[PDB]
Every structure is written in structure tokens, then in C-alpha cells.
Amino acid sequence: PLRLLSSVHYLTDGELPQLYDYPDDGTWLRANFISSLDGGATVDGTSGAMAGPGDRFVFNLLRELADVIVVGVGTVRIEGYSGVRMGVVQRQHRQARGQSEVPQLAIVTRSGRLDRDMAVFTRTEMAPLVLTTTAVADDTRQRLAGLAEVIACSGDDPGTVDEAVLVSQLAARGLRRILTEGGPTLLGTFVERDVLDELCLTIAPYVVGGLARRIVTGPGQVLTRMRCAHVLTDDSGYLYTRYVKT
Amino acid sequence: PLRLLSSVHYLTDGELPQLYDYPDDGTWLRANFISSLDGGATVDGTSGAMAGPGDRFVFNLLRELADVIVVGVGTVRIEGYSGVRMGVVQRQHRQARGQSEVPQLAIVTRSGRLDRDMAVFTRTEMAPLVLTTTAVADDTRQRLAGLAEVIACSGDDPGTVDEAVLVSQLAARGLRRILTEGGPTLLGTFVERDVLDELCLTIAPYVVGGLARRIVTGPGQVLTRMRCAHVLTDDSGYLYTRYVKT
Ligand SMILES: NC(=O)c1ccc[n+]([C@@H]2O[C@H](COP(=O)([O-])OP(=O)(O)OC[C@H]3O[C@@H](n4cnc5c(N)ncnc54)[C@H](OP(=O)(O)O)[C@@H]3O)[C@@H](O)[C@H]2O)c1
Ligand SMILES: NC(=O)c1ccc[n+]([C@@H]2O[C@H](COP(=O)([O-])OP(=O)(O)OC[C@H]3O[C@@H](n4cnc5c(N)ncnc54)[C@H](OP(=O)(O)O)[C@@H]3O)[C@@H](O)[C@H]2O)c1
Ligand SMILES: COc1cc(Cc2cnc(N)nc2N)cc(OC)c1OC
Ligand SMILES: COc1cc(Cc2cnc(N)nc2N)cc(OC)c1OC
Predict the structure, then answer these.
(1) Of A204, A201, A206, which Cα lies nearest the Cα of A241?
(2) What is the spatial distance between Cα A240 and Cα A51, in angstroms, rounded to a whole number?
(3) How many CA atoms lie within 13 A of B96 on its CB side?
(4) Cystine design at B190: which of B46, B157, B196, B206 (Cβ 3.0–4.6 Å)?
(5) Where does NADPH bind (chains A, B) (predicted)?
(6) Cβ of A210 and B40 within 8 Å?
């Protein structure tokens, strides 16, 4: 029943985006995370130290493919999120697909407690979206006037974000090709709400010890089956995987 | 820089053990763990629910190849460890390699607080080893007289286990082909002490939510680079990976 995987194909830079194409239509929520062999999402508080050149390339590619990059406010602070950068070629490829030159950032926050002074607001070509709750969207909107478009993402409960609404709120604005880069709380919610369509997961060839949290924190305990779409590798032993529900 | 992995080879039951051969000589500490996509070592408190037929086959194969299966006392209680089972063919293959018919169990405990009444002692063809500290080995030996061989595995500190000594204590008894199936505390220590030579890691195609701990718990924060030896897959989307230091 066991098949050996090995490298069968060098991926030209035209095929690589094909591997990670979004659906032709409909909203697609893709997560991109990196994890150590032993399930560690962080080394020294962030994921950067595991992100080798291979993973950075895939990471930037996924951003390049996305209409919007949805990120929890914690990751935004902790990983020092600034505006998405798109090089001339990235922009070109994006226009070629009928996309804006750079994807937007969508910051998710139930609290609304974002400061006017954050790199996501400051070092950014496009103003980011703030995805938050009906309860606090208005004050958040005013407090962040000029910096971000604040979007109420409550479903039935005006005090929380309904992650399915979040997704539709983005799609409603033509940001249907969604990428989230976390964090683990945010990813946890996408998981619980069963709105995660896709997990792109870099498995870094490291063990990091027990201190690190996983790429998904929270109280959720689901058992969402996903399908292995592909696994890529490089010379450094990284596995760049792509899993799709269900 | 990116190569697509795909199934290039169906593994006959003779090749599969070759993929997981132990070195011809020297002690080798191999860990076998299963993890969800999102780094969850457990579903509902144990790893069983992620272990499909593919993973059970590999798991039993690794046991089959091992001279001894080293397991922390917590995993022994929590996963209801009983004696290792070896079928007639498993035994045959083991004898063919000059190995005993079934590998031994080695239970690791710093405390020594094992009960005479445990399935590891009761439903077992071979009495298991108890790998513990110099400080408590004697009382442990007496309290477990008839049930287990108690082995002092302290290095410089008689109050703790030195995991390198643990490994040598097993090798000294001709149990040099070591497999550990955890748990995460135990694996954490193997990692910190840098004695883990190999991680066989099943990546189950599931996301499980944030509740689960990783396959490595503890305060350790290392960055041990490992080399991807192989990745196998089955029809169910499982990745059966084998990583080797360094
Ligand atoms: N290995 C990787 O791939 C990876 C990727 C990203 C991050 N990380 C790491 O994980 C760590 C941070 O974890 P984190 O959980 O705090 O990140 P996070 O999910 O980005 O931040 C959590 C916060 O974002 C908001 N949020 C998340 N989900 C929400 C939801 N469904 N509805 C409303 N708000 C939501 C909340 O903000 P409010 O409190 O304002 O309501 C929440 O407190 C960092 O160290 C980071 O480096 C790792
Ligand atoms: N996904 C997987 O592959 C996998 C595999 C195995 C287990 N698990 C799960 O993880 C959970 C249990 O975790 P756990 O950390 O408690 O398991 P564990 O490592 O087997 O048990 C911990 C205990 O074993 C002893 N121990 C471990 N390392 C030691 C060392 N270096 N020196 C001396 N003693 C040591 C200690 O016993 P004393 O307290 O007596 O000193 C320690 O308290 C279970 O739910 C289990 O299902 C998952
Ligand atoms: C590619 O650059 C970085 C990317 C990330 C996050 C991240 C990195 N890799 C993957 N596969 N998923 C992610 N969500 C984190 C970083 O450090 C915080 C980075 O800087 C090196
Ligand atoms: C194969 O049978 C089981 C194995 C395990 C532990 C385990 C399972 N799979 C892997 N890859 N590593 C491990 N350490 C755990 C189990 O449940 C506790 C099992 O029963 C189904």
C-alpha cells in the first residue's frame, strides 16, 4: 500500500504557480504556514528562522497569487507585518491575471483594538482591511479613519467574527482568492468554523523542542480530513505541501 | 529550486524494511511519531485516531526492526501499552536478522514510580526494561522484582536520566537498534540531549484544532537540522517520512 515519493520534476517558474492556482471561481481560503518536524510553528517567537529560501519563494508566490492576505492582529504585531511587497514581475503576473498590483492585507480582530501607529498601516502601498465585529466596527472605523477599511464580519453574533462571513466579506469585495498566514489563533478559528479550504504547509527539516506552540492554537478539537494535493521539496529537505479539504 | 514529489515506486514488503534499515553497527535511536498537519500529536488524548492502516503497518514494521522500543512511562499508561506483539512472520524476519523474536519494551522513568500492576508488565511476552535513575534504580528494582529489569541510566547526576547513557545502557545489552514511540516529554529529552538520530514521522492528512499538544513537549528550544531521507505515501494522503540528523 506504500509508495515511495521522490523528485520527478523540476518546477519551472510557470508551473509552480499552476500548482498553487486558486479555483477559477468561488471564494478560496488558503492557509500558508511553516512547521518544524515536531510541530513547532515558531523558533524564537516567530516562524522566520525556519523559512529558508525555498519557503520564502513559495510564501511570496502564495502572496503573489492571493487577492488578499488575511492575518490575525497578533501575527501582525509579532511578525512585524508591513505592507505586502510585490516586485515588478510579481505585479506584472498579478495584472496578467486581472488582479491589482499588490494584494491587500486584512487584519482580523474581535477586539478592534488596533493602534493608528502600526507598520501594517505605515509601510504599506495599499491600505489594509480590518476584519472585525459588528459591535466594534464603527468605533474601529473612526479610530482608524484614513488608515484602513474597517469591515464588520459578524454573522448572528455582533460581538464575534463569523469566519464564514469574514470570507464572504472579502469575496464581496472581489477578494475571493484568500490567503491567510495566520496566526495559530486565527487559523484555529478558520479550522473550527470549517472555512479553511486549503493548507499550504511548509515542513522545515528541523526539530525545535517543546517550547514552540503549533501552527494552530485554541481550544478547538476537530478532525478535518484533508487531501494531499502535492508535496514539493528542494535540496534542503523542506517539504512544501498543499492539502485541500476534504 | 523546487522539485515536485510524486509516487515513483510501489514498495514491495522487502523494500519497505530496507527503507527503514538500522545502521549495520552502532546505537541508533529512531523515533516513530504521528502528527496531524497542524502539529497535533493527539486526537482525544492519544495518537491512535490518526493511525490509519498505512501508519499501523509502518509502525509495526518499525517495531519489527527494533531491538528495543523505548517509551516514556506516561505514554505507557496513556496509550495502554502492552507487550510488543510479533506475528509469526515478524518473528521469522526478526530471527533472520539475528534478533530475538519480539523486541523488548524499555520504560523510561525518572521517578521510578511504576506499579507492579500495569499491562506493560502483564500482557507481555518479554519482561520490559525500566530505564531510570541511579538514585531510585535500587528501590525500583526491588519493587518491580520479577516484572522488569531495572537499569540505572544516570550520567553525572544520579537523580536524572542521561539520555546518552540510556542509549548506551540499551546498546550495552545488545539493544542498539532503538525505537522510541514517545511520548513527547520523552522525545523532548532525546532532542535536548541531542541523541535522537532519526525521526520517523507520519503526517496524517488532518487538521485537529489547537487543543492537542505536539509530538514534543517540554521547555526545550533547539534547532536541530535533520535530513529528509524519504517520504512515502499511500492512497489516503498520509506522508510517512523519515528524517535523519544532521
Ligand atoms: N509557523 C507559522 O506558519 C506561523 C504563522 C503565523 C504566525 N505564527 C506565530 O504565532 C504567534 C502568534 O499567535 P496568535 O494566535 O496570537 O496570532 P493571531 O491569530 O494572528 O492573533 C490572534 C489575535 O488576532 C485576532 N483573531 C484571530 N482569530 C480571530 C477571529 N476568528 N476573530 C476575531 N479575531 C481573531 C484576535 O485579535 P483581538 O485580540 O484584537 O480580538 C486575536 O487575539 C507568533 O509568534 C507568530 O510568529 C506562526
Ligand atoms: N502523536 C504521537 O506520535 C504520540 C506518541 C506517543 C505519545 N503520544 C501522546 O502524548 C501524551 C503523553 O505525553 P508524555 O510526555 O506524558 O509521555 P511520556 O514522555 O511517555 O511520559 C512522560 C514521563 O515518562 C518519563 N520520562 C520521559 N522522558 C524522561 C527522561 N528523559 N528521563 C526520565 N524519565 C522520562 C517521566 O516519568 P516519571 O514521571 O515517572 O519520572 C515522565 O514523567 C499521550 O497522550 C500520548 O498519547 C503521542
Ligand atoms: C517568507 O518570510 C517570512 C514568512 C513568515 C511566515 C510564514 C513563513 N513560511 C510559511 N510557509 N508560512 C508562513 N505563514 C515569517 C517570517 O518571519 C516572521 C518571514 O520572514 C523570513
Ligand atoms: C499503530 O497502533 C498505534 C500506534 C500509536 C502510536 C504511534 C502511531 N503512529 C506513529 N506513526 N507513531 C506512533 N508513536 C498509538 C495508537 O493508539 C494509542 C495505536 O493504536 C491504533
Answers:
(1) A201
(2) 11
(3) 10
(4) B196
(5) 34, 41, 45, 47, 73-75, 109-111, 163, 183, 185-186, 189, 213
(6) no
Mutate to test the interface with A, among B3, B44, B194 (most CBs of A within 10 A): B3
**Amino acid at the residue B106:** A
Q: Are B108 and B102 in contact (CB under 8 A)?
A: no
Instruction: Tell me whether strands B104-108 and A149-152 are parallel, antiparallel or unpaired.
Output: unpaired
Do the chains contact at B214 and A39, CB–CB below 8 Å?
yes
- Outline where A20-175 has alpha helix (H): 53-65, 73-78, 88-96, 119-122, 134-143, 163-172
> How far off is chain A from B190, nearest CA to CA, in Å?
10
Tell me how long chain A is: 246
Count how many domains chain A has: 1
- Hunting for cell 515511495 — which residue is that? A4
The phi, psi pair for B214, rounded to 5°, reads -85, 180
Q: How many angstroms separate the CA of residue B224 from the nearest CA in chain A?
A: 5
Resolution (A): 2.3
Range of the domain at A66: 1-246
Chain B residues near residue A229 by CB distance under 8 angstroms: none
> Rounded CA gap, A121 and A201, in Å?
28
Q: Is B195 within 8 Å of B167 (Cβ atoms)?
A: yes
Q: Which residues of A206-226 are buried (b: 16+ CB within 10 A; e: fewer)?
A: bbbbbbbbbbbbbebbbebeb
Which grid cell sits at B105? 519494551
Q: How far apart are CA A245 and CA A224, in angstroms?
A: 8
Ligand 2 geometric centre to CA of B216 (Å): 9
Q: Residue A120 maps to which CATH number?
A: 3.40.430.10
Experimental technique, in short, is X-ray
Cβ atoms of A225 and B208 closer than 8 Å: no
Q: Which three cell numbers stand for residue A195?
A: 472555512
CA distance B178 to B31: 8
Q: How many CB atoms lie within 10 A of CB B68?
A: 26
